[PDB]
Structure formats: C-alpha cells, structure tokens
Amino acid sequence: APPKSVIRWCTISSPEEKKCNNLRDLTQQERISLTCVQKATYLDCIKAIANNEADAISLDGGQAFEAGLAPYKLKPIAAEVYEHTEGSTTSYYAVAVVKKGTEFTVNDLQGKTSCHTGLGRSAGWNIPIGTLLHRGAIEWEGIESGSVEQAVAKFFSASCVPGATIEQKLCRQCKGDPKTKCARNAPYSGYSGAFHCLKDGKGDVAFVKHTTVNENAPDQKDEYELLCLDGSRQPVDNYKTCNWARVAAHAVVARDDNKVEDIWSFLSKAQSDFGVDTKSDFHLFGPPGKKDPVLKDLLFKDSAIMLKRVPSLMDSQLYLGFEYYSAIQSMRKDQLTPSPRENRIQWCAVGKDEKSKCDRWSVVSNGDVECTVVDETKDCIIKIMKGEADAVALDGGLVYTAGVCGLVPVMAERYDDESQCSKTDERPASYFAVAVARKDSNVNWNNLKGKKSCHTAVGRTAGWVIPMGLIHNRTGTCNFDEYFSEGCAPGSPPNSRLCQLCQGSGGIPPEKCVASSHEKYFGYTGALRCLVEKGDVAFIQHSTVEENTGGKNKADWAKNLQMDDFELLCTDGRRANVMDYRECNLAEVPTHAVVVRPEKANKIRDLLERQEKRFGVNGSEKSKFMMFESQNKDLLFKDLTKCLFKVREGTTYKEFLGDKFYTVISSLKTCNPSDILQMCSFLEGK
C-alpha cells in the first residue's frame, strides 16, 4: 500500500459540521479525503478520537492540554499561525503590568489587591492564580483547606475577578453596579477593562494580554511598566522577556500512531489550495468575518493564516510550555499525586551505572537528590525541559542542542585542581582540539578528501563533532562516512566504511571498531596510535601527542616515539609545530556543565556548590563518598574533576562554547537534524 485516505474531522456545534461538509467535495476529487463528524463537545470528540473513531481537532490552550493526557493521550500535528509585527506567530504572550516605582516584585505581593479578566480564564485568573499555587505563593494544595478560589482571597486582600458566587475577598476591586459589577459581562474586566483597575488605582496589578496597554493608550506607559517572574521589572513593549506564560495557537490535535500525514496532507492540500488566496467561492480558515458569535472560528479560528506543522517529539507539555502546562496542572490535572513539592535537587543519571551512582548519593545527601533514570542520555533534555528532571552535566556537543532546547549552562567542571575556583581572576581552562599529522605527509587540510583519517570515537566532540564540523563547511550532503578514503571512528556501524581501519578486538570475537577499550584505537591515545601504522591524519586533543610521546607510553609502539615526529594540520594549510597548538586548532572546547532551567538555576548552582562540601573531594564527608567518585570511571559527572567552577550569571549556550566552536557544532547539525534539536528548534522562534 502507498498513500491514499479519507480523514474524518470532529466538531462541536452543528454549524461547523456542515462547512466541515462543504469542502468534503473537492476532497473527493483530490488525493485523500474527509467525512465530517459532530458531537456535543470538544471532549466527547477527543474521546471519540482515541477510540480509533475520528481524525483530529484544532484545540486551544485548555483543550490542547487535556487532549494529551492519561486515559487518552493526544498530541499536535499542526498549528494555526497568524499575523503580527515582530517575528513569525504561533503564540500570544501573557503578562501582569504594574505602575512604575513598583513597590513590589512577585516575591511578596502576598496581600496587595488584584485585577482580573475574570475566572476559569487563562491570561487572568488561571496563569496568575495558577502559577502562585505551583511556585508556592498561595500555599493551598488540597482545596479542602485553601481551595484555590478560597485560597486566592487569603493571598491578596481583594480582586475584581468577574466570577461571584463564591470568593469573598476577591471581587471588591471591581466597580460598576452594586449588583452587576463582580459580573463577567461587566466592563471593568477582561483585558482592556483589566486596565480599568490597574490604571485607576484600585488594586495593584492587572494580568492582561500580550500587547494591550498598547491597544489601550499606545501613548502612556511609563506610569505602568510590566513585571517579570525573575524578581525583575522591564519596559512594556518588551513582553517576550517579561511574562508568566505564552500560549501557542490552537493546534490540530490527532491520534499518535499511523496515518499521520494522511492529515498533514488532507490539511496540506486543503491549505495551499483552498487557503485564503485561491479562487473557489470559499475560505477555509474562513475570512476574518466577525458574525453571529455562533459561526465563529468555525473549525479554524477566523484570525489564523496557516496550520503550519508540529514535529515529532512534541507531546503537549511541550507545545504548551512549562509556564502554562504546569501552572494549570497545579490546579486540576494534579495537586499532589505525581506533581508534588520537592525543594531538593533531582538529577539525571543515565543507565544502571549512573542511577546507581545516584541511589548511593541520594543518601547522606538525605534524598536532597531525587533521581530520574534515563535510557538515552539525549533524553535528559526533554526530561529537565519539562521539569520531571532537575539537572544534568552535559557534553559540550549537546550543550548546543540543549541550548537550542531552552536549557542553560550552570557551572562547568574542572579536572585540574580545586586548588583554584573560589574567585574569578582566572577564566576558562584552555583545552583545545587538534588535527595531528605525521612528520612528513602530503596531508594538509586541503588534501584531506581521499586519505585514511583517524578519529577518537563516534561523537566525542574532539574526535568527530568538531572535525566533521568544519568539513561540512565544504561537504554539504553529510556523508561523513564518504569524505575520507577509509577510517576508524569507533562506535560506527558494523560493516561501515569509516569503521574499517580499526583493528579493535584484543583477539577473540573481533569486536572490531566498538566505542570501548575492547579495541585498539578507542579514545585519543589509541586513535593517535593508528595514525602511525596506517593512518593518514589524527583529529586529537592538543596534549595527546605529548602524553604518548616522550618515553611516557613505554609500549613497543611509543617505545621511542617523540612529538619531534608529528605535526598538527591547521585549516590554513599551514602546519605549525605539534605544540603551536593554540595558533592552529580545529576548535577550543569548554567543559561539561550542569545544565538546567533558567527558572530554577541560581539555586541549582547553590544546592550544587553546597553538595560538594559534604560529598566531594575536599568535602569533609569523603570517607562517605565524593559526588565525583565512580567505582573507577565517569558516571554522572566525571571522576578526575576537582572543582565545579560556576559560570557567571547572564551567560548563554553560545557564550560558553564561543562562536568559533559553536559555529561548527551548530553547522554540523544543520546536516542531520534529530528529534530534540529539531523539536526544540521549532518552538524556539515559532
């Protein structure tokens, strides 16, 4: 079978079942198909979808959440983009303004009066009264002793949220009629109205929408400038930098399994074709014709332009983000079963050698170090990114993908001596990359293509993520395994081609070319080796030549070896001494670094800088167990490390790498894009 289907959209109210039936024609006369469907609710629908019954449903914030939840499990495979003035649009930022000379942050509003769009709302009520419940602001959890609504009263000493009935202290900052004022259909509410509360004097803050003060008085502002989460306070046109949560446009929710594109497509075509720019009596996203509140956003919000896409890895904690996904989960979706209150540092160990190195440490550490086992160490990213994880010490290469993902550097390792760290007169450790060529070989970067090169391992930055970096600044299609004649980059496929030159296996089941020691060329020292016997190059550490050479590697192969015998290939064509390393290197690489979220950072560096004293080399409780120990290896952190220096605040994923070594590890991926890097990049500027 190839690719031919007849999709069946769900609905809600009747009107939309027909338009969802007014296109079903050209559908026939066109590659795939439809078949409308209707049901009292957006819910009965989602249900309907996990029952192998339906197709998909464009659902907004709330709808998008519940969509992909237990009992069901749904996810986005499309997203309504729209129009603006800044960047592309797949959102709508939410904020909480304040009058200048702010007499508060977000770290003590415990009391002041509020202004709110209403209740059961997002911009207002939800993210505001639903973010303070997560962070801690409002300390209720089990509504039987501080029921949100009842819990919001005891925070501020009022409000004007147009949802009466319950809540005493929570409507008094209103103003209208002494009967129809705490009334939703009133007017000192909403967002515009929400201003008519924070601009008058009643209350203190107004949680409005991205750009409204703007819709209001695009003149005045200085009187009321925003209020960030990070105890900060910015200007007003600067939202993307000072919000509580961003809301992505209403996706296109569908069943995660097979027939996927049979929707992308049945959308894809419908789109480009019956978009809003073709000529066949009818608008899909409909034109922006305001009408009976009834025929509104009929299957696609009016004000939308094109159900873009939505990659693979995106679940629903993602497409929504941490801000709104969690804020919410604090209310309904949860409150204590999974999501609980852990003010300790969780962590990301990978494999039965990391978690092991974990449920060993989370002991005198007295659980102040939860642990979330991880299959693949590329998983830790989606892990922390969502919150279920608290940290991870990453490989420079990944500190790139992570960075694209939203995470950030905290503190980088340091293997020299802890005999330095406590200060900042000294900058980063000077550890470089290096192409190492033999004494006399027609080999210079230019002649590269055709020669037998020798790597350190499939990945390990120096031996693969940095050489196959520059290269791809000359080798578009990235058949890395088709650049050099032959080679040995341990951890390559079986048969492979770059995995040939290896001589691995001691002698038994020829484990020829594996990423272990079981081989005779894994790592630096051994790859270097290679370059002697057969090799024609060697992308290695700078100090890897002075280690094996100089009567230090008394093996019969480096018995008499000496740096005097090799030379490093610069990209220039130039070939400096083996030691003129700093003036001829493939890249300058930074140390791994506990990545985490910029939301909970300053404390992670704190609860990490305090977790060394008890456990950690010069950590008095050493008889117990240093956190860098590893039964003799590199689990969790490293081993050799001595002090985990702290990188200066306000850094970035770029800055720690440089822009010289980030360019390549960045233009190296341009090549083959993966789930994460491709999943995080999307949202990025979406």
Closest CA to 354 of 387, 386, 389: 389
DSSP category for residue 563: G
Whether 431 has a binding-site annotation, put simply, is: yes
Residue 460 annotated as binding site: yes
651 labelled ligand-binding: no
Q: Is 121 annotated as ligand-binding? A: yes
**Spatial contact of 82 and 249, defined as CB atoms under 8 Å apart:** yes
324 is in an annotated binding site: no
What is the token pair recorded at 136?
Answer: 């801690």
Q: Is 613 exposed, middle or buried (0-12, 13-18, 19+ CB in 10 A)?
A: exposed
Q: Which of 249, 243, 203 is nearest to 109 (CA)?
A: 203
Residue 393 known to bind ligand: no
Cβ neighbourhood burial of 385 (10 Å; 0-12, 13-18, 19+): buried
Map residue 534 onto helix, strand or coil: coil
Distance (Å, rounded) from C-alpha 96 to C-alpha 208? 6
Residue 648 annotated as lining a ligand binding site: no
117 is in an annotated binding site: yes
In angstroms, how far apart are the furthest CA atoms of the chain?
97
- Looking up tokens 């497509």 gives 265
614 is in an annotated binding site: no
User: Is 60 marked as binding a ligand?
Assistant: yes
Reduce the DSSP state of residue 432 to 3 states and report it: strand
462 labeled part of a ligand binding site: yes
State yes or no: 56 annotated in a binding site. no
The per-residue b/e assignment along 536-548, b for 16 or more CB within 10 angstroms, e otherwise, is bbbbbbbebbeeb
| Burial per residue of 226-249, b for 16 or more beta-carbon CB atoms within 10 angstroms, e otherwise | bbbbeeebbebeebeebbbbbbbb
Q: CA-CA distance, 432 to 438, in Å (whole number)?
A: 19
395 is in an annotated binding site: yes
What are the residue ranges of helices labelled H in 387-541? 398-405, 467-470, 523-531
Q: Is 219 annotated as a binding residue?
A: no
H helix or E strand, kind and range, residue 381: helix 379-386
Q: Annotated binding site for Fe(3+): which residue ranges?
A: 60, 92, 191, 250, 395, 431, 524, 592
Which residues are annotated as part of the binding site for hydrogencarbonate? Answer: 117, 121, 123-124, 456, 460, 462-463
Instruction: Point out the annotated binding site.
Output: 60, 92, 117, 121, 123-124, 191, 250, 395, 431, 456, 460, 462-463, 524, 592
